[PDB]
Design a protein around this ligand. Sequence first.
Ligand code: ZN
Ligand code: ZN
Ligand code: ZN
Ligand code: ZN
Lengths: 385, 50, 295
Amino acid sequence: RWEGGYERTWEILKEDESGSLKATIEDILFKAKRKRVFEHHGQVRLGMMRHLYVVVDGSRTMEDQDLKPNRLTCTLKLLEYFVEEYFDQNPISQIGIIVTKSKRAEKLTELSGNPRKHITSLKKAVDMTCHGEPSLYNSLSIAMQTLKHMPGHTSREVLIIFSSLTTCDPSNIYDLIKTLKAAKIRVSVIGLSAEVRVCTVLARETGGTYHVILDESHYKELLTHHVSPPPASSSSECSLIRMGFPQHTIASLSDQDAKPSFSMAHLDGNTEPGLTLGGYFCPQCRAKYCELPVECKICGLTLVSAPHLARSYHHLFPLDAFQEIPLEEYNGERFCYGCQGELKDQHVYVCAVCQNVFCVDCDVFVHDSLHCCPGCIHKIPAPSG
Amino acid sequence: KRAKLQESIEYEDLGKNNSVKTIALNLKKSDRYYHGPTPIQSLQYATSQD
Amino acid sequence: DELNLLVIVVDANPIWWGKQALKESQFTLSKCIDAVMVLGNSHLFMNRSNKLAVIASHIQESRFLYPGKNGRLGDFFGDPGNPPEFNPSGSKDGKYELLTSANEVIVEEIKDLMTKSDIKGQHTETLLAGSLAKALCYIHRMNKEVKDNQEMKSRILVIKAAEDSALQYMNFMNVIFAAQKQNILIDACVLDSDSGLLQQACDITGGLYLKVPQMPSLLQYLLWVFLPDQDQRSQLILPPPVHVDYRAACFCHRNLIEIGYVCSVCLSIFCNFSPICTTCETAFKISLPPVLKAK
Ligand SMILES: [Zn+2]
Ligand SMILES: [Zn+2]
Ligand SMILES: [Zn+2]
Ligand SMILES: [Zn+2]
């Protein structure tokens, strides 16, 4: 009785050219693109120093065929971009890498601000076997003991990323919530598929957010939001003294090979030896070592300069775009303030301070790198000068 | 709201003491005084004539 | 096959250039245009498929010398990559046809800028920080279209000729980090005035803070050192090594910071002698000022 229905089914499937006349696949594409949601959340904090402990899951569930047949190479590869972007906008801050395997929590890297140390360490986890049985209470209790040594003035948030396992609660994590709040720490949880309710309350009581990754493009957007510090305000974390302001030197006069270069053997900077060209030095100790914003070993504080260290945190502070205004008369100078030419296809963006018209290539660069408006230099300093 | 208020405070309190670091103000006033007095009006006409 | 681009930031200041001719100088404002006449031609000699972009720096705005903002080079671009509606001059680029038209736009655009300088508003100096804010918006618009097949390797050239004004120097640092994401190089060509903010653009991105001695010796330091090819600049070695070093100190304070602390929790770096607030409306506990004041 198969051919009795298979012969008549092919007659309908063969005449598939009649469905292309209707505008079904076309009308939905233009309506699904105009769906522009607007939920601007004020994610900003005045605290410049941040301490983070990224938790990486290493169970057997890191090999499922979701976004790609090898999930193990999906989290480790995309985490290198988060580390490089973290030091790009926040070089004075540092992160940490803590893995979890064989029902144990083995801390890989320490609390250092070396971008090369955290990137090269993730490539070694490729050969690491995935046994299974992840533990959340083990990777969270150890991170609090190390974070306790930091003075109370930072957000001291904790990031936890797992394979969205069905409730990764070892043995009643709700009893730990009353303890994590006393340490004034924060927990951030990122999901990948199934919902986790046992971690949603933890991200709300401590102070954070909870999101589930839906596509490969959504995982990159969520990491950008975590670059900015979490929006909060406390009273017991607002005391700090002695900030290190190093200076950049070259350790030469005319030629680099004619001089003993920098970061050699007899030099006090024996932390990262090799053959470099220059570095920083403490103004209160004259200790020359690597130029990476890391905690020195003669004072006990990280390096927060000003040119390309503390400015990166202030460069991300003005997070704002532009508005729009429709019209049915075709008017508005149509001359861009940055690239002169426009697009002339229903795209008029004005400013809320100087009112300047931009195109599709200038508005994207503002919310991504420019972070302000070029017209604020030829209008705001005008009356004050 | 507090972060939006602290942005206008730092951006405005510096205009009264701008370029006051080192020689960022001495070199700026040196070129202004070398040209001569500006409120005398007579010198302003010779500047645009050049 | 391959295209390039060079953004020249000319510090056309009628106040500084108007007083340099009194000191018996042969390189005045009339000779400053000749620098673009030579650099604009030597750039196209290596590759006839290049593009030219010159941005001025006036005391009121940053006028685009090439292409201009008028009805000739504003709406319609005279770039060599547009054969339609532009071919009486954009056809013989191999000599003095399109190269002369590129300099003619600068002379035509500067006509409206020189006449609009009545200096009746006392003195306002040149807004040098606003010049780099327009160069990033121009290199990003052309990169979105040329990102296919080609790559367009460009650079950023800055020619300093005067000091700054009452502008906030924080805006001059926003264009430095906004240019590092695109992996671009920023240069600096001072003439007489020296500033510590322009030198920061050469140390962060990896540029070169060159100091020009005499004025007529300008064609030598802009062709080999400031070459848009940037292929052999790592082993070139022509300008003298950098000896001085200028960075940044306090924001709203009259002191050189080196160990000082901010006001409270904001970003205004001040000093360590502050038990309470200063110029904000915050607070600070008395668990550290009693310790720092002692020693
Ligand atoms: Zn030290
Ligand atoms: Zn535009
Ligand atoms: Zn604006
Ligand atoms: Zn403050």
